[PDB]
Amino acid sequence: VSTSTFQTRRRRLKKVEEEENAATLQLGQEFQLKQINHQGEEEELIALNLSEARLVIKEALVERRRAFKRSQKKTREKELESIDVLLEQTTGGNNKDLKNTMQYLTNFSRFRDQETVGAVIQLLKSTGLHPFEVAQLGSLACDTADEAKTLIPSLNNKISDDELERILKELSNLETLY
Amino acid sequence: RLVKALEDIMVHYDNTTRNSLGNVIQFIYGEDGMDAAHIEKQSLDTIGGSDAAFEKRYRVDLLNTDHTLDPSLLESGSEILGDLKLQVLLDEEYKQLVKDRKFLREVFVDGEANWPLPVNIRRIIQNAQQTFHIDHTKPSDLTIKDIVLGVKDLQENLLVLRGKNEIIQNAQRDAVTLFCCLLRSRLATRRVLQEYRLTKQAFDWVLSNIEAQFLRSVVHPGEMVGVLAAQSIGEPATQMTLKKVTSGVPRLKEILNVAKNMKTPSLTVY
Amino acid sequence: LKEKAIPKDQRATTPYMTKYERARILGTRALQISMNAPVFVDLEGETDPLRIAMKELAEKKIPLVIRRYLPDGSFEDWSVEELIVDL
Amino acid sequence: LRFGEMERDCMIAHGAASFLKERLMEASDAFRVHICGICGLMTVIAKLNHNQFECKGCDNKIDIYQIHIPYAAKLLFQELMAMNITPRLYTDRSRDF
Amino acid sequence: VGQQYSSAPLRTVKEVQFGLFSPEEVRAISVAKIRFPETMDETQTRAKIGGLNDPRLGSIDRNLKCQTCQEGMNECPGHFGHIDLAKPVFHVGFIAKIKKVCECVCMHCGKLLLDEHNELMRQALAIKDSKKRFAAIWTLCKTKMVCETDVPSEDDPTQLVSRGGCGNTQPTIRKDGLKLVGSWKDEPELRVLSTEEILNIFKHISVKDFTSLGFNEVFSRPEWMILTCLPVPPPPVRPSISFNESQRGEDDLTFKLADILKANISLETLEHNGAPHHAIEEAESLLQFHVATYMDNDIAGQPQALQKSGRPVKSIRARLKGKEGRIRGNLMGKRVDFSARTVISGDPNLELDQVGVPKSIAKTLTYPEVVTPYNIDRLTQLVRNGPNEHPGAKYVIRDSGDRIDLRYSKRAGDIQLQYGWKVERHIMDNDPVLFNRQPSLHKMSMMAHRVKVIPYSTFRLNLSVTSPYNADFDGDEMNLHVPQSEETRAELSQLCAVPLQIVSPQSNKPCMGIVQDTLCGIRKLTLRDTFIELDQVLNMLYWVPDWDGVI
Amino acid sequence: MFFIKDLSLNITLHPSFFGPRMKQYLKTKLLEEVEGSCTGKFGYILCVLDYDNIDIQRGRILPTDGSAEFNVKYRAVVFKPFKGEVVDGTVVSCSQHGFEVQVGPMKVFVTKHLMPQDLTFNAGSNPPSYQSSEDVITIKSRIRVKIEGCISQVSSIHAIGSIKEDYLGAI
Amino acid sequence: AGRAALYKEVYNVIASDGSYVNYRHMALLVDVMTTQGGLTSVTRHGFNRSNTGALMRCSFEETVEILFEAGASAELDDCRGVSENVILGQMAPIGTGAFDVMIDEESLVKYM
Amino acid sequence: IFVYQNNITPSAMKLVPSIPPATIETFNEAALVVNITHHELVPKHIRLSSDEKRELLKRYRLKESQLPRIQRADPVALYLGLKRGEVVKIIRKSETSGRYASYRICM
Ligand SMILES: [Zn+2]
Ligand SMILES: [Zn+2]
Ligand SMILES: [Zn+2]
């Protein structure tokens, strides 16, 4: 009667396990790499960038707006105003958090096209770097290898500085004009 | 005490009698998988009497003028005279009945005909003779094939255990054994067309009623067989208002407590 | 395990409904009919939820599924429509 | 009136599980406790007016379950607790068997 | 439910994990400190002092308090406390298991007296049943009374290998009521074994040994068998009943607990101050008594903790012991609501499947019905009729769980109904019930009948139905239980009903037949000598309810 | 950062709702109970994806009341922030103590001391701002912040972030 | 042969009173007593020595004691027995409570 | 198999399980005289193979503990030379079925 997951550990009475969550990929019990899909199989962790996320949300809101019409029988600035409208229909005011997240995601959007976002994901998943690193490198607009290995301190020497610079310089070309 | 010792014990969705742990006690409750209340005391006609009286009541010979069924009893009776293909089935029936006689005389030392079994065969016969207005004058239309193959098929439909595999099929076969012997004893080609004089309609109805009444008789998964058994032992032990050996309440507590130091130790040599 | 969900094919459990089963299906269904649950069978002037449930089982218009548990942990899911109420 | 062990026996034999549940709980005794998801003890300080919970010695204001058990059971458990024995109640199993 | 809603998810107990309380865990869970050996009356003020009873634990009066939860007396269970014992003490039940483990392990080092190297030990360690494994291990190493350091190898015995440490001699331990004594060997060193000594040796036992001795490193650690911190039971376990004002009305356990605090304070005092060493162990042996006598008074070692009256004190062990105890007195067998007991009288005009219930029991026993469209009109009329007009109701429970007592309700002659509410109505005719007779020896003694509300004080059952109930009408009393749920009564109808019990599965035959009056009557009636004329025959036909109408 | 997790929810239905379009009310109650809600263990549960392909399942009826326990299995876009996480956001409120930068559904507070030397508070300019020889943080400016600590609350999760370390602050 | 001899005597005691009991009940108690590999007693030293849940075993003769052996052997209660569900005040898996009930979303829309 | 007239010394019997994989069974001369299985109330106990055991537990869906047991030193258990873990399909006579197939595992 609240919100349940899928993975449960053995209640061996003791509690001392919940360690500090750090920059160096120390995610939560649920948030680690080996996430389990609802059908009962292994799945790599899901991590979206500040654009891809907005796209997923916008897709699912359009699909709920449409899912309701079946059962009803028996640039930049324009987007803010369109999102206002869709939200006011798909949600019941309570989602004040989701509405704010929609405004923030549409504001700080790195790439506003599923096409460009796709090409970005192709360029990033090719690293072999962890989903959170992939997502964060996709939401933060860096220019330098030093800037990137500092804002994302999980990198360090998981990737070559020059190679990371090549990825970085490619992202800047992929950038969206408002 | 008895109640407590048998609490957790009940019949499961597989017919196995199990406890709280899940350890098996009885593979198919009561060794037959039948509910106590549906069972009635009947007679096995394949046990007693001389092998001659047995022959007189079960043996059918189409090939012998001094043994053949009179066509006043069977419509196909005049044309049955000689048919070995049919005679081979009569020899199958009679071989099964004789195998039955020797099996029953092996299960019961004394050879008692009277035993508790489901489906009151006695009743259905009378009931058919009431419903179909059976007259012991006009001949029975039935084919000697319709009878023998009707009983052979009925046996195949008398289920207790459904499971597809061998162990289950063999278990089903074992548990139904005694009832199939009684069924064969009362459904022989002499009895069917002489003692009962069943018509095709009456016979086919009788088979359906044996099938339904048997299928109903199977124990119900959830039946608290344990507690029921305990109380079935408890009530007559309470209503116990009582050549020299302890019996009644003393011998009873003696057994329940498994006395290594028994009051009346008796031994009987044959 | 949820693997213990025996397929709709292969069923060692009896096709008939047990006395314990019909009594609980009817009890629960009448209890729901009293919590003002929707009645599928057309009420031939019926006031008593028990009778309503009895007709509901007669017209096989009950939406209930009996999860029969096999001792080992396993289970065979059967419908009220699937089961025979010969009794 | 006493629904004694005798009556218990008979109802079980009959197979009327829901009646016996009613007669043991619902009608007679009846009680609801707030046990911890870590240690199966009635520790959780349920302040249900403002939905505050917490199991001190667990730092658990998250995993709490409400359970329907007779007050004589809450009692039995508290008397076993009183003798230094832990009668831990777990809502979900592991044994299978 | 314990009345009032909580958003906490409702679940069922699917596992019961036993074990021991860790003194650190008792200490952690503890809501109160426990320091005062008194009760209430802080400077004689009718209020519990911050020491024993409600230093947080729980209220003794019709006034809120229970550390931040409160909720009153009802709905809120008691909250535990702690006692810090100046010296540790043995546990009554664990005394023998403590002795057994002491005989199993070497003192000072804390290692098993027996190792894998022994063939019979290998044969023992094979058992994984905690009970049988430990039973084997103790019987095996109770003989060994020297911790072997040097053990002959699985090669040739000429080469002894060091399995462990200390070639120290073990004492022959024997009981003495509350304490243990051992001896080493001219003359045996007969010495007293202290709680502290035993605890440290237990603390030193390796987890391998722990489990291989019939324990568990997580739930039940051998060390915790010796109590350091006592768990203080809250007021619902030890009720204090302040009768209006001028009275106290305490409980047995409360007294024993206060006696423990007395013994503990007297011990602590001698530890800090003047310590004559073997003069202090006097208050320790008394603490040993008080603590063990708080749990069990019906001990073997004679002295029972008698009260200032002569009552040997109601100990926890006695509370739980069955045959009208706790288990068999409150959980296996209990007192119920919606039940009736009156004298039984025989009747030939009723039905087999019925029970004659007096109007006075009908107007008392009540079924809570649901406000449904199918019976909304009937329920509104019962609510009009009230509690005294036979076809009526006693209470009206709303969806909100609020209950209106129809009698003290001044506007109970206008009251409007809305769906899903409950109208607690009188026992209406043809309502199923469980009519049973004590002792319920077999299934049949507990049958489900149909209701027939009749005048005159007795329960009227059918003559033929006395056979499975096994009692005459010589002034026999019978129980009658009211099923509260639609499914509960459905169970009574499709399982427990009188016509279903006709054929007894105890002996595959019927249990009910025609009896006494009806029996001698039917024999005399069935004859070639028995003749009846037209006039009496017409009436004999009319007396058949299911008569075809054909003479 | 934004995760997409597979989650379940135990929704309980009353028999009155056992009418053909039940699935509608189950999906709806799931969206009432979960959408917008924040938890410590999972964070802000923002949006349940694919309204249609939400697992309905067979609902277990209770033996006390006719009510049915359903375990509705879904998938949703979730937001859980962490220490070390570097995220950009927009100012909301400001004081002598510091400014509060809004990141997604949450407010990450930047203390005075978590800002470099030059950054000096000045309320004597409406709206109260922060000054330097290049940087001026006011009402709704864009800042890149490094989260240092998190607080798990009601249907809220807050954080404390620094900007003193390199490549951070105003953008 | 022990199982057999035991039934023979139990039956001879039921017939000593001169009463009748159906084979099944007796064969049941008898097979209960033998399953354990030998002749198992019907007392505190008989059945209360079994592997069965501590809560069930405590409901007969050795209460406090078996509960102390439960807390000592960190015993686990499976909650599959009558007594253990009775103490907990729940629907025991006996009779009516053996199976489970669920509604089908599909069938609910089919009938209307 | 070793047939001893009256007794064997405990100094000798130490050599009984000493030689693997082989098993050394010991039965008294006097105890052999009369056959146990030949008695009226002794039903037929049948030794099972590893595959027969695996199929028995596979079909009924049980654990080894979940099976009825036979003592290791049982007259029929020694007669059959049953080893700890072996199963026997006891086919007996039933006054309500004719035949009943029971199963017992070694202790
Ligand atoms: Zn806890
Ligand atoms: Zn409280
Ligand atoms: Zn040592």
Domain-wise residue ranges, chain C: 1-87
Q: Does domain E5-88+254-295 have CATH number 4.10.860.120?
A: yes
Q: For B23, how many CA atoms within 13 A lie in the half-sphere containing its CB? A: 20
- Considering only CB atoms, D73 lies closest to which of G88, G92, G97, namely G88
What is the rounded CA–CA span in Å between residue A134 and residue A53?
A: 13
DSSP string, B185-215: HHS-HHHHTTTS---HHHHHHHHHHHHHHHH
Closest CA to H7 of H24, H31, H36, H23: H31
Rg of chain D, C-alpha, whole Å: 16
Cβ-contact B179, B118 below 8 angstroms? yes
CB atoms < 10 A from the CB of E359, how many? 15
- Locus of tokens 């082989």: H22
What is the rounded CA–CA span in Å between residue E315 and residue D82?
A: 11
- Considering only CB atoms, F167 lies closest to which of A6, A31, A150, namely A150
Distance from CA of H26 to the nearest CA of B (A): 27
Pick the CATH number of H35-107 from 3.40.720.10, 1.20.1530.20, 3.90.940.20, 3.40.50.970: 3.90.940.20
Distance from CA of H76 to the nearest CA of G (A): 10
What is the rounded CA–CA span in Å between residue A28 and residue A19?
A: 9
What is the rounded CA–CA span in Å between residue E274 and residue H16?
A: 68
Rg of chain F, C-alpha, whole Å: 22
- With CA atoms as reference, the chain G residue closest to C39 would be G112
CATH homologous superfamily, domain C1-87: RNA polymerase subunit, RPB6/omega (3.90.940.10)
Output the CA–CA distances (angstroms, integers) from residue H94 to B27, B29, B32, E267, in the order listed: 13, 12, 9, 72
Contacts 24+ apart (CB under 8 A), D57-63: D57/E25, D57/E28, D57/E29, D58/A15, D59/A15, D60/D36, D62/D37, D62/F40, D62/F41, D63/D36, D63/D37, D63/D38
CB atoms < 10 A from the CB of G106, how many? 12
Cβ-contact E397, E368 below 8 angstroms? yes
How far is CA E157 from its chain centroid?
57
CATH homologous superfamily, domain E365-427: RNA polymerase ii (3.30.1490.180)
- The dihedrals phi and psi of E517, each to the nearest 5 degrees, come to -55, -55
* The token pair that represents E7 in the structure block: 């958003």
* The token pair that represents C62 in the structure block: 């009950």
Closest CA to H105 of H71, H81, H69: H69
Chains in touch with B (3+ beta-carbon pairs under 8 Å) read C, D, E, G, H
Three-class DSSP category at G25: helix
Residue B37 contacts H where some CB pair is shorter than 8 Å: no
DSSP string, D19-65: HHHHIIIIII---EEEEESSS-STT---BTTTTB--BTTTTBSS-EE
Cα–Cα–Cα angle for E520, E526, E530, rounded to 5 degrees: 105
Cis (ω within 30 of 0) for the bond into B139? no
**Which amino acid is located at C81 in the chain?**
E
What is the rounded CA–CA span in Å between residue F33 and residue F37?
A: 7
Q: Which residues of F touch D (CB under 8 A)?
A: 40-41, 63-64
Task: Measure the CA dihedral A63/A67/A70/A73, to 10°.
Answer: -130
Q: For H82, how many CA atoms within 13 A lie in the half-sphere containing its CB? A: 27
Which residues is chain E interrupted after (C–N above 2.5 Å)? 185
Cα–Cα–Cα angle for F14, F16, F22, rounded to 5 degrees: 80
Cα–Cα–Cα angle for E332, E334, E338, rounded to 5 degrees: 135
* A–F interface: beta-carbon pairs under 8 A: 162
Tell me which DSSP letter residue B58 carries.
Answer: H
Ligand closest to the CA atom of residue E59: 2
In the CATH scheme, what architecture does the domain E338-364+428-501 have? Beta Barrel (2.40)
Domains with residue ranges and CATH for chain D: 1-85 (3.90.1800.10)
What is the rounded CA–CA span in Å between residue F58 and residue F56?
A: 7
What is the rounded CA–CA span in Å between residue E207 and residue E111?
A: 10
Method used experimentally: X-ray
CB atoms < 10 A from the CB of A65, how many? 14
Pick the CATH number of F85-171 from 3.20.20.140, 3.90.1150.10, 2.40.50.140, 1.10.287.620: 2.40.50.140
Closest CA to C20 of E487, E494, B162: E494
For chain G, list the strands marked E by DSSP. Answer: 36-37, 76-77, 100-103
CB atoms < 10 A from the CB of F35, how many? 19
- Locus of tokens 């009984």: H16
- The dihedrals phi and psi of D41, each to the nearest 5 degrees, come to -125, 145
Contacts of E506 in chain B (CB under 8 A): 36, 228, 231-232, 235
Residue D18 contacts C where some CB pair is shorter than 8 Å: yes
Distance from CA of A71 to the nearest CA of F (A): 9
What is the rounded CA–CA span in Å between residue D94 and residue B164?
A: 31
Closest CA to D12 of F66, B229, B216: B229
Contacts of G64 in chain E (CB under 8 A): 93, 296, 317, 320-321
DSSP string, D57-72: TTTBSS-EEEEE--HH
DSSP string, chain A: ---B-S------S--TT-PPP-TTT---TTTSSEEEETTTEEEEPPB--TTHHHHHHHHHHHHHHHHHHHTT---THHHHHHHHHHHHHHS-S--HHHHHHHHHHHHS-S---HHHHHHHHHHHHTS---HHHHHHHTTS----HHHHHHHSTT-TTSS-HHHHHHHHHHHHHHPPP-
Q: Do C87 and B216 touch (CB under 8 A)?
A: yes
- The dihedrals phi and psi of D60, each to the nearest 5 degrees, come to -105, 100
What is the rounded CA–CA span in Å between residue E55 and residue E59?
A: 10
Residue ranges at the known binding site of E for Mg(2+): 472, 474, 476
What is the rounded CA–CA span in Å between residue D76 and residue E319?
A: 9
Element (H, E) at F149: strand F142-152
H13, with CB counted inside 10 A (0-12, 13-18, 19+), is middle
Q: Given the DSSP bridges, would you call strands H69-70 and H98-106 parallel, antiparallel or unpaired?
A: parallel
- Considering only CB atoms, F40 lies closest to which of D18, D62, D68, namely D62
Closest CA to C40 of C22, C67, C58: C58
Size of chain A in residues: 178
- Locus of tokens 């009393």: E477
Cα–Cα–Cα angle for C60, C65, C71, rounded to 5 degrees: 135
Residue ranges in chain C assigned as alpha helix (H): 19-34, 49-58
Touching pair G, A by Cβ (3+ pairs < 8 Å): no
E67-82: burial string, b at 16+ Cβ within 10 Å, e else:
bebebeeebbbbbbbb
- With CA atoms as reference, the chain G residue closest to D75 would be G87
* The token pair that represents B93 in the structure block: 């029936």
- Locus of tokens 């499976």: G78
Contacts of G100 in chain F (CB under 8 A): 60
What is the rounded CA–CA span in Å between residue F52 and residue A70?
A: 11
CB atoms < 10 A from the CB of A84, how many? 12
What is the rounded CA–CA span in Å between residue D82 and residue E233?
A: 6
Contacts of D2 in chain E (CB under 8 A): 333-336
Q: Do C68 and G107 touch (CB under 8 A)?
A: no
Cβ-contact B75, B24 below 8 angstroms? no
What is the rounded CA–CA span in Å between residue H107 and residue H20?
A: 21
In the CATH scheme, what architecture does the domain A48-72+75-178 have? Up-down Bundle (1.20)
Residue F53 contacts E where some CB pair is shorter than 8 Å: no
Q: Do A15 and D39 touch (CB under 8 A)?
A: no
Ligand closest to the CA atom of residue E32: 2
Return the HEC string of E386-408: CCCCCCCEEEEECCCCCEEECCC
- Considering only CB atoms, E328 lies closest to which of G59, G69, G74, namely G59
Residue G67 contacts D where some CB pair is shorter than 8 Å: yes
Residues 36-65 of D with CB under 8 A from A: 37-39, 58-59
Per the DSSP assignment, residues forming a β-bridge with B191 are none
Three-class DSSP category at E98: helix
Task: Measure the CA dihedral F120/F125/F129/F135, to 10°.
Answer: -70
Element (H, E) at B26: strand B24-26
What is the rounded CA–CA span in Å between residue A168 and residue A161?
A: 10
Closest CA to G85 of A146, B10, B13: B10
Domain span at residue B202 reads 33-220
* The token pair that represents A127 in the structure block: 């690293």
**Which amino acid is located at E472 in the chain?**
D
For H87, residues 6+ apart whose C-beta sits below 8 A from its C-beta are: H47, H48, H52, H53, H56, H67, H103, H104, H105, H106
Residue ranges at the known binding site of E for Zn(2+): 66, 69, 76, 79, 106, 109, 147, 166
Residues 236-255 of E with CB under 8 A from D: 236-237, 253
For H47, residues 6+ apart whose C-beta sits below 8 A from its C-beta are: H80, H82, H86, H87, H88
Closest CA to A131 of A45, A42, A51, A29: A45
Contacts of G54 in chain E (CB under 8 A): 16, 18
- With CA atoms as reference, the chain G residue closest to E225 would be G72
Q: Do G37 and H42 touch (CB under 8 A)?
A: no
Q: Do C38 and F18 touch (CB under 8 A)?
A: yes
* The token pair that represents F20 in the structure block: 């053909």
Return the HEC string of E216-276: ECCCECHHHHCEEEEEECCCCCCCCCCCCCCCCCCCHHHHHHHHHHHHHHHHHHHHHCCCC
Q: Does domain F1-84 have CATH number 3.40.50.720?
A: no
Chains in touch with C (3+ beta-carbon pairs under 8 Å) read B, D, E, F, G, H
Q: Do C79 and G107 touch (CB under 8 A)?
A: yes
What is the rounded CA–CA span in Å between residue E304 and residue E311?
A: 9
Domain-wise residue ranges, chain A: 2-47, 48-72+75-178
F57, with CB counted inside 10 A (0-12, 13-18, 19+), is middle
How far is CA E192 from its chain centroid?
39
Q: Given the DSSP bridges, would you call strands E366-370 and H87-94 parallel, antiparallel or unpaired?
A: unpaired
Cα–Cα–Cα angle for E447, E450, E451, rounded to 5 degrees: 125
Residue B223 contacts E where some CB pair is shorter than 8 Å: no
Cβ-contact E227, E68 below 8 angstroms? no
- With CA atoms as reference, the chain C residue closest to B214 would be C87
* D–F interface: beta-carbon pairs under 8 A: 8
- With CA atoms as reference, the chain H residue closest to G5 would be H41
What is the rounded CA–CA span in Å between residue E486 and residue E484?
A: 7
